[PDB]
Amino acid sequence: ALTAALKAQIAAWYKALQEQIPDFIPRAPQRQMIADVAKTLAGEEGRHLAIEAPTGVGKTLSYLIPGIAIAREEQKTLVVSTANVALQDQIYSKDLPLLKKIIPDLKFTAAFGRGRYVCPRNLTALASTEPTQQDLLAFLDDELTPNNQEEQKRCAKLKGDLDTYKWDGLRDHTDIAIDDDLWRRLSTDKASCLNRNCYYYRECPFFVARREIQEAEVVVANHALVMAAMESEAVLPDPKNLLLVLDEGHHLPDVARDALEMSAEITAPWYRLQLDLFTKLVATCMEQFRPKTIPPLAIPERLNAHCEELYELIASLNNILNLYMPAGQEAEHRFAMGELPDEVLEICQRLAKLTEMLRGLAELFLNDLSEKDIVRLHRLILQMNRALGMFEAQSKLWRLASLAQSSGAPVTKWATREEREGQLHLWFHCVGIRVSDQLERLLWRSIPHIIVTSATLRSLNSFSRLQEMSGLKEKAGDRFVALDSPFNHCEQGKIVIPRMRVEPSIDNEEQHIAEMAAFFREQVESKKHLGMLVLFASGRAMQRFLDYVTDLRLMLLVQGDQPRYRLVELHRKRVANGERSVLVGLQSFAEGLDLKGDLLSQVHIHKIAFPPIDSPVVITEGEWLKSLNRYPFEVQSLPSASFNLIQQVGRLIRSHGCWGEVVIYDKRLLTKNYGKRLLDALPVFPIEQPEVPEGIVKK
DNA sequence: TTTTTTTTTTT
Ligand code: SF4
C-alpha cells in the first residue's frame, strides 16, 4: 500500500519544508504520526486511526503531508474536517499555503454551509435601495429595504468589498459586524434562491465555492458539514473516493448527536393555529399556482381529515402530559429510562406518521414553487418554507420519541411547560444518549480509512471513553495511538491548589466564590503575571465571580462581550504593552485559547467541571448505566471531568518557553480518592498548596 | 463509592 514512489514523495516534501521554511523543526512524534497516517490512509494497516497529538507535535502538517501525497497518487480528495469555522480558517490560511510553497501545484478549497454565504441579489437590494422611515406598509411587506441609513451604508461597503474580492461573501471573513437579523436577510434558503433563474447565478459565492470543491485535492470542512454530506450524498465526492481527516475529533459524537436531538412545541391551541394556517396555505397554493404534481393529501377533504386526526392526537397528548404537572405553573416531566407508557407511545407513533406525511406534502409544494408573478410567488415560497421547517421539527421529534433505543441506549424523553409571551407553552424534547450506530453508518463503514486526531482524545489516561462514545473498536481494525507531549511541564510550570476552607458543593457556592475571588485578587495584586485566564463551569458562577471583581472591569475581557477573536486581539495588544490583562470565560475559552508565554502565565480554574447531575439526559443515562450494572459516577461524571480538566489545564503550556501556574480552586483534587486519578491524567506538574485569605461574602 | 448546566454547525 505504501509504494516506493509514495514514500519518496512524502520524504521529499518533508525535507523541502524542513529546510526551506524558517523554524520548521522535526520531531520523532511527528515522524511517527506521518508514518501512522500514511499506513492507515494507504490501507496498509487496519481500518481507522485515532491518534492523539498533543500541542507541539505538529499535528496538522503531520496528516496533511501524507494525506496530500496519497490523494495525488490516487486521484482522490483529501477532506480535512475540523470543529468550527475559525479552525477551518486556520487550516486554510496558515497550514495549506505553507504546503503550497513546497507544492506550488496544490489545489485546495474550503467548504461551508449555505447559511454562511451572502446572497448577492439580497445584498444589492440592501445596498442600493432607500430607507424611507420604515414606510409602514413597506415594513409590513418586509420588502428588502435597509431598515435605516446606517444599515444602507454598511451594506454598500460590504457590496464594494464583495465586488472587488476584498470579501469572499462568507459571514466570518469580514470585519464589518453583521447583526443576526441582517444576516437572515442577506442570505436565503435553498428554495428562496433563484438558482439558474437569477441574473447573479454565475456570480454567487456559494455555488462558486461548491464548484471549487469538485476539482480540489484538499477540501477543508467542518464536522457538521461532513456529517450532512454523508446523509445527503450531495456536497462531497463519493465516500469510497475520500481520504478523511477528522481533526478536533473528540467533538465527533456530540456532532453526531444533532441527528438525534429535537425540541418542539406541542401545545394544543398553537397547534390548531398551525394546522389551520397550513390547510389554508395549501389551498391558496393550488389556486394561485397549480403545482405540476398534486398528491392525494393535497385534496382538501383528505388534507383536513388528516389534520383533524393529527390535532385530536396532539390534544390527547396535551391532556395526558398535563396530568404529570401542576396546573397554571411552569413544570417539567421526564420519562424514566426514556420509556413511554403504552398509550403515549402509540400516540407518538401515529404522530410520527402524520407529521412525516405533512412534511412530505410541504416539501413537494416548496420544490414546485421554487421550480416555477414573482412577488406573489415569493411570499408563498416563504410561508411554505416556514411550514416546512415546522413539520421537519415535528416529524423528527415524533420519530425520535417513538424509538425504543438508539445505539443500544434509551433516547431521553421529557416535556416542559414554559412561559413565553404571557402564556404557558408545552414542549416535547428528545435527546439520543448514544450515537455510535450513527457514526458507524455514516462514516466508519462508509469511508475506507479515517484519521481521528486531536490534542485531546483520552480521558483518565485511556481511550475507553472515546471507544464507547464513537464506536471505534480494535476488533474492527481501528488503532489508537497516544503521542507524547514534547514540552517539559514539570520544569515549565506548576499546579497550585489553594487551601480553601470549603469544597465547591452546592450549598457552599457563595463562600467558595468569595474565597476564590480573594485569592485571585491577591494574585492580580502581585503583578507577577500579565496574561491571566479565569475559567468557569457555569455562567452562573462566572457572573457571581464577576460581582466580586467589579473594580477590575478595565482589566477584564469577558466571554460574550465581544467575539472571541476580538477579545483575544485586545488581550494581545495590552499584554504586549506591559499591562495586566485577564480573560474570563466558559467552555469556549477552555477549548479555544492558544496563548504562548507572556500572553497566558496564570490559569484560574474555579472548579472541576463535573456534568450536571439533575439534567434529564444525564439522569436517563445514569438509569441506563445502572440497569447494565455500571456505576454512573465512574462511567459518566468522572471521565467527563477528567477530559475537561485536561483541556482546561492545557491552556498554560502551549510552547517551549511557556511558563506559569494553573490555580485550581477545587480542593477535592486532594480531598477525594478520585482526586488522584484526575491528577494522574494530567501532565506531571509540581503541586503547591498556599494559604487562602478570608473570604468576605457580598450581600 | 459520587457528582450539579457549555456550544457550534448543517441539510
Ligand atoms: S443565486 Fe440564490 S443566492 Fe445567489 S444571488 Fe441569486 S438568489 Fe441570492
Author numbering: 2 to 373, 378 to 704
What wording appears in the published article?
DinG is another member of the XPD family, that appears to have a poorly defined role in DNA repair. The proteins comprise four domains; the helicase (HD1 and HD2), arch and FeS cluster domains. The FeS domain, that is inserted within the HD1 sequence, contains an iron-sulphur (FeS) cluster at its centre. Here, we present the crystal structures of two complexes of E. coli DinG; a binary complex bound to a ssDNA substrate, and a ternary complex with ssDNA and an ATP analogue (ADP•BeF3), that provide information about how these enzymes translocate on DNA.
The DinG binary complex structure was solved at 2.5 Å resolution by two wavelength anomalous diffraction data based on selenomethionine-substituted protein but the final model was built and refined using data from a crystal of native protein. Although a twelve base oligo-dT substrate was used in the crystallisation, only eleven bases are evident in the structure suggesting these likely comprise the entire ssDNA-binding site. Overall, the DNA is kinked but with many bases stacked upon one another along the strand in a conformation that is quite different to that observed previously in any other SF1 or SF2 protein. In all, three bases are contacted by the HD1 domain and seven bases contact the HD2 domain, with an additional base spanning the gap between the domains. Notably, there is an aromatic stacking interaction with Tyr636 intercalated between the first and second bases at the 5’ end of the ssDNA on the HD2 domain. The major protein-DNA interactions at the HD1/FeS domain interface are mediated by two arginine residues, R117 and R211. For DinG, in the binary complex, the HD1 domain has a tighter grip than in the ATP-bound (ternary) state. This is achieved by increasing the number of contacts with the residues towards the 3’-end of the ssDNA binding site. Indeed, consistent with this hypothesis, there is a large hydrophobic pocket on the protein surface in this location, particularly in the binary complex, that could accommodate a variety of bulky lesions such as thymidine dimers.
